Design an enzyme around this catalytic site. Sequence first.
Site, PDB file in Angstrom:
ATOM      1  N   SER A  17       0.834  -1.193   0.000  1.00 25.79           N
ATOM      2  CA  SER A  17       0.000   0.000   0.000  1.00 25.79           C
ATOM      3  C   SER A  17       0.879   1.256   0.000  1.00 25.79           C
ATOM      4  O   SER A  17       0.666   2.163  -0.799  1.00 25.79           O
ATOM      5  CB  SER A  17      -0.995   0.006   1.147  1.00 25.79           C
ATOM      6  OG  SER A  17      -0.362   0.048   2.431  1.00 25.79           O
ATOM      7  N   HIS A  65      -2.775  -8.573   1.484  1.00 25.94           N
ATOM      8  CA  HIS A  65      -2.392  -7.363   2.208  1.00 25.94           C
ATOM      9  C   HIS A  65      -3.422  -6.885   3.255  1.00 25.94           C
ATOM     10  O   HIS A  65      -3.030  -6.545   4.356  1.00 25.94           O
ATOM     11  CB  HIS A  65      -1.947  -6.263   1.230  1.00 25.94           C
ATOM     12  CG  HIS A  65      -1.235  -5.139   1.922  1.00 25.94           C
ATOM     13  ND1 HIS A  65      -0.968  -3.914   1.339  1.00 25.94           N
ATOM     14  CD2 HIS A  65      -0.743  -5.059   3.193  1.00 25.94           C
ATOM     15  CE1 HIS A  65      -0.339  -3.135   2.233  1.00 25.94           C
ATOM     16  NE2 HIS A  65      -0.192  -3.809   3.359  1.00 25.94           N
ATOM     17  N   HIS A  68       5.167 -13.514   8.396  1.00 31.83           N
ATOM     18  CA  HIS A  68       5.349 -12.186   7.824  1.00 31.83           C
ATOM     19  C   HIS A  68       6.565 -12.218   6.908  1.00 31.83           C
ATOM     20  O   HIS A  68       7.507 -12.964   7.155  1.00 31.83           O
ATOM     21  CB  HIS A  68       5.542 -11.116   8.906  1.00 31.83           C
ATOM     22  CG  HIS A  68       5.225  -9.735   8.439  1.00 31.83           C
ATOM     23  ND1 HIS A  68       6.045  -9.025   7.592  1.00 31.83           N
ATOM     24  CD2 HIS A  68       4.171  -8.940   8.696  1.00 31.83           C
ATOM     25  CE1 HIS A  68       5.501  -7.838   7.357  1.00 31.83           C
ATOM     26  NE2 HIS A  68       4.362  -7.769   8.011  1.00 31.83           N
ATOM     27  N   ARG A 112       3.024  -4.376  17.252  1.00 31.47           N
ATOM     28  CA  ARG A 112       1.657  -3.950  16.977  1.00 31.47           C
ATOM     29  C   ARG A 112       0.703  -4.929  17.661  1.00 31.47           C
ATOM     30  O   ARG A 112      -0.282  -4.516  18.271  1.00 31.47           O
ATOM     31  CB  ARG A 112       1.396  -3.818  15.467  1.00 31.47           C
ATOM     32  CG  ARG A 112       2.266  -2.781  14.760  1.00 31.47           C
ATOM     33  CD  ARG A 112       2.039  -2.640  13.268  1.00 31.47           C
ATOM     34  NE  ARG A 112       2.167  -3.896  12.533  1.00 31.47           N
ATOM     35  CZ  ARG A 112       1.879  -4.066  11.240  1.00 31.47           C
ATOM     36  NH1 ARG A 112       1.537  -3.037  10.488  1.00 31.47           N
ATOM     37  NH2 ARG A 112       1.939  -5.267  10.693  1.00 31.47           N
ATOM     38  N   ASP A 172      -2.537  -8.687  12.641  1.00 31.06           N
ATOM     39  CA  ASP A 172      -3.769  -9.218  12.051  1.00 31.06           C
ATOM     40  C   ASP A 172      -4.328 -10.389  12.879  1.00 31.06           C
ATOM     41  O   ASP A 172      -5.510 -10.741  12.782  1.00 31.06           O
ATOM     42  CB  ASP A 172      -3.563  -9.618  10.582  1.00 31.06           C
ATOM     43  CG  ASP A 172      -3.089  -8.476   9.690  1.00 31.06           C
ATOM     44  OD1 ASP A 172      -3.723  -7.412   9.739  1.00 31.06           O
ATOM     45  OD2 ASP A 172      -2.082  -8.657   8.968  1.00 31.06           O
TER      46      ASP A 172
END
Lengths: 435, 435, 434
Positions: C240, C270, C318, C327, C373
């Site tokens: 992105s 993504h 990842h 995160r 995620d």
Amino acid sequence: SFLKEKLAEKIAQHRPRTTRLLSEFGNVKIDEVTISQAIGGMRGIKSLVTDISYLDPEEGIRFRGYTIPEVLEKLPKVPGAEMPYVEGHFYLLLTGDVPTEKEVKEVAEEFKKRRALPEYVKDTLKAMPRDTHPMTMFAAGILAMQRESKFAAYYNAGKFNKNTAWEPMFEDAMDLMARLPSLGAYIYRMKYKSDTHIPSNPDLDLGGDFANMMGIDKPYDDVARLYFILHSDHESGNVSAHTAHLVASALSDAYYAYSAAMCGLAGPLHGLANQEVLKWIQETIDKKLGGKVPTKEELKKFVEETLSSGQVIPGYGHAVLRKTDPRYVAQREFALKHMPDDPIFQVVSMLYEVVPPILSSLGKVKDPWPNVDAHSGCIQWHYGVVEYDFYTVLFGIGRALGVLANLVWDRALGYAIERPKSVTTDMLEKWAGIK
Amino acid sequence: SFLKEKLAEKIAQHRPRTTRLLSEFGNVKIDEVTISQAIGGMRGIKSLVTDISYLDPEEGIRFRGYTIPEVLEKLPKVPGAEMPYVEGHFYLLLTGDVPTEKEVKEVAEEFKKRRALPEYVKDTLKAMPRDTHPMTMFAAGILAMQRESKFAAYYNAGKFNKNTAWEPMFEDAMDLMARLPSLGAYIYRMKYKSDTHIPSNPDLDLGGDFANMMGIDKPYDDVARLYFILHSDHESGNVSAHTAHLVASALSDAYYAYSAAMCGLAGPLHGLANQEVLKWIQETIDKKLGGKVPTKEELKKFVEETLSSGQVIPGYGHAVLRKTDPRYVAQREFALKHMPDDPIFQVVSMLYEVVPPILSSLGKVKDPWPNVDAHSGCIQWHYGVVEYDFYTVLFGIGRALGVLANLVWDRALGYAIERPKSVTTDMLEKWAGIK
Amino acid sequence: SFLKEKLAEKIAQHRPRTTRLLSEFGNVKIDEVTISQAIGGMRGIKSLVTDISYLDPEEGIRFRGYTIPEVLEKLPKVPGAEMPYVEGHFYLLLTGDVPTEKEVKEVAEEFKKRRALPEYVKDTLKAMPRDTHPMTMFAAGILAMQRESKFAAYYNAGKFNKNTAWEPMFEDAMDLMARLPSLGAYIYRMKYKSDTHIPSNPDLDLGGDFANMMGIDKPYDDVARLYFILHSDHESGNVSAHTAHLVASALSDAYYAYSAAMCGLAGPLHGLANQEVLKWIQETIDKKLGGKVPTKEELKKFVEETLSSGQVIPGYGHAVLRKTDPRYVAQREFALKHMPDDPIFQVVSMLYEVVPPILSSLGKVKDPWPNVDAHSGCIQWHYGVVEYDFYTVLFGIGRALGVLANLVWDRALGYAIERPKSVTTDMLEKWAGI
Ligand SMILES: O=C([O-])CC(=O)C(=O)O
């Protein structure tokens, strides 16, 4: 097609760019100043503008965008000889354009009528003790002719106009440039050649007639032509070019400005390198090489010991040049053809080999490469200019070509007085947090 | 006590501070450079270091941290006169210390023994046409004495060393400073007083002997002590002090350096404002004001008429000063005290009242206030120094006091060759995005 | 603005540095390119430069040097709430300086006056079929607004200058960021909440107004501020951020750039993992655990069944991370405080413990560890954001912070058009020796 007319045109094209740059982009940042730079002679600060020449630190000096090899090919050549008219190079520095044969000829006719040395310049140099350094004499000669300044006369009659001021500056520049070779020659003859003088020959060009007045046969006429073009300018931040610019910025005429400039070029850290190389070599050829052309090995290790003991190889450093110098290069090309066997040349050639390897490898040496005055002396010595102190006079004649060109343009564009701001040791201490 | 040994002491304490700023705090940013500044002769760039004097835009000049009023207060006075020994001011600029009476006496004795002009200087000035400008003669006289340079002999004897270079610099500064008044007076007499000379009185101080040699009665001795002290230094960024600095930075001696400096001071944007102010007042009195000292209100309207038609008021404004010049102030106090009823001074006084409010309202001038050059002329003229061109030579004599002190320190501290970088118009145009 | 000239200040200092590297050390080798990497999507090649953030394989993401803990800690907090002004994070990303309370407030005021949605964005979204995926609506809304581009207006009127081009880019960045939450929220209402719309509250902060406009009570305000900061940026090589970079490198404005950004983020590889995780957990909870939180043991065995059937534990692994994602860490901190008793979280938590050991000792997944995620879904569902597809729109609003900061610098530092060189398979076969 006349120089002054063409110069007027170029001035008319260039002024809007300067105006624009000031009106629209005045506050755009181009550099910073560090404590180091203020204490260390403004080193490297981009704070001066000239278009006569630009010194790329990697690529060599360019004269009006051209390269030395380009200049030497493009400029019209003196007939019956090999190098360009110096007058053509002045046309180029003044205007930005290579001159035609026709255009050179006109400048050279102009120099012929402006070349005669005022008799009182000789009176003055005779009154100065004969043991006075040639550069002091050279500066004095320039200064005394301030009496003749058309720019000073223009100013004192109240004719000053920001648009037209370049016109008497151009006149003074043509007059002074025409005469410098004669003044230098006179100093050479009177100090070093028994005070017998050879008259100016009206049919010769600037460099040709310098050789004549110096009393040196062909091909010194080409040595001079080449030497002067080569030393003609090195942008405006060198001390001599800067000194001229600075003094002129107060609207002092060129006589004052170039006299002041020669006071700078006289300095050991500016105009002495050519001779000091040559004396270094001769002494090396004497003591360290049994009076003889050495071999590659011998020289290789001679360097290393001189280095290891807190000594510098002369003419292999520089404050702005970071690569090899193409002024150096043009000298060689001349030497290789005209004096390949000369013993001194053979050692400056060989030095070309090893000393870049050793400084590149030792490390540091931000400029591990030869500057021009690593070469100039062997050519002069070859032809019997043995009077070392005088070398700087040759430099002064040459450097005027670009500097006086520059002064015309300073005035054409109304560049203001140069007046930086001083600071104290205490102030620097504050800004550094010290207390 | 002894000047040289105290100077040594001050150098040995200063040198570590400079060392430290370089060694620890070198890449501390102190300013930036814009396109305007490259083109506008470095205006505002903080790129020079001196401790001799510092020019504050608001307060004006401080000499070694002292204000003009406290300098005139604290320096030992000549007996039977109002003003300090110029030799005392010189001690202050060299050392940073206000000298005792004993300490000035030994500076005065040292100058007494270094005062005499080399005969060949007189020979040289006679060979130069008599109609040569006095500043050209002054510069020439300085330059010719480069023959005596102890600094040059020291360098040429291979004795250069960064610890000791200040010492022959000091010797040259002392030699030259002692003689400059005599050089100027010789020029004054030879040009303007029928080429009759008044011998030096070995019993007078520098200021008193200068008035003696000029042939001007008391209190011109005090006019000269004050004039010279006021003109002694204006930090190092002014064209003349900068020219000397730049030239000496290549290790050119004080003679070369200061001859160069006087070539810049010759300039109409640097050394002429005094005479131009005075001519302006006298012409104004004659034509616009019916040869009479006007009323307040009559002169306020003459100023505006002049300002409205595209003219300027001479001796007002400055490229650095932003308020009233304290040098102008010190001249005023002298004038008020000594020549209240002088017609020309009256106009000068009234100008001081009238002009700043008018210039301030219009906001054209960034420094709507007088500088010293608004005042010096009326005092010179009052005592019969009517030879306008010579005024600048007086400036030259005074300015050597700080500039020569400055070259000594430049050498003490090993300040490096001045070598800023030039950029072209094309380069400014690229940086500006108009590539 | 104080922001705009703080930024002018940083640029003028940073440019010589960039020029220097170009001018002096431009030939210095930095990395190498193997056939593997050319075929496998530039994997591991150091071909991009950015200063907004840097992704360390081991420590994870730093924002302008700072770690996530530090950023949460130093940034001014919202009165009455746990979390930072997102405006504050934007300032930091732009300038590099942690902002004062006053500095944060100036950005918040600036956003409050830039916040209003052009009515034709609403017209455009209504004309798009209501059944269009929210990310399509999101990208279309951004794209439509390139009519307002100041950067484009400045190009078209002849005014381009390599020194001044960052300035209209900055205006657009501020305009678009101020609107992204309102655009997002309009899509959410129009599709999923009966097309009734709660007006923007101009006294609220970016995140608080988002929750206000979404129609969710506290602490969803904080869920958002946290969510947006954590997704703010992940250096420039993620699809992105890279897409926006690439597009803008041709001097396309931020509306074009970020629209393109959202087309990439839309992709299954993504922007979908958050939702794909949360579904798989829901399935598992229902069709493998008899609809109930298992025991640690029951679930250690479940992970192996799945794995040894050739299935993957979503939300782990990842292409760049190689240790745990900070995160993920931060989301977990929030959960433990606000919803320990949540069933879905409890499985997220258990998973945290049992999956790395398995994944590690299997030696297959190069990152035997969670990314964010793995966590975000359970939080969103807990507060009744059940609409899976919309999660990726949250990511979009978040990720704009870092990307639009990044485009301002790209133009500030004058980075050239990104234009690498293509090669055929043949040529690769020739450099293989066949
Ligand atoms: O960094 C990546 O490549 C994908 C990702 O985690 C993110 O965009 O936040």
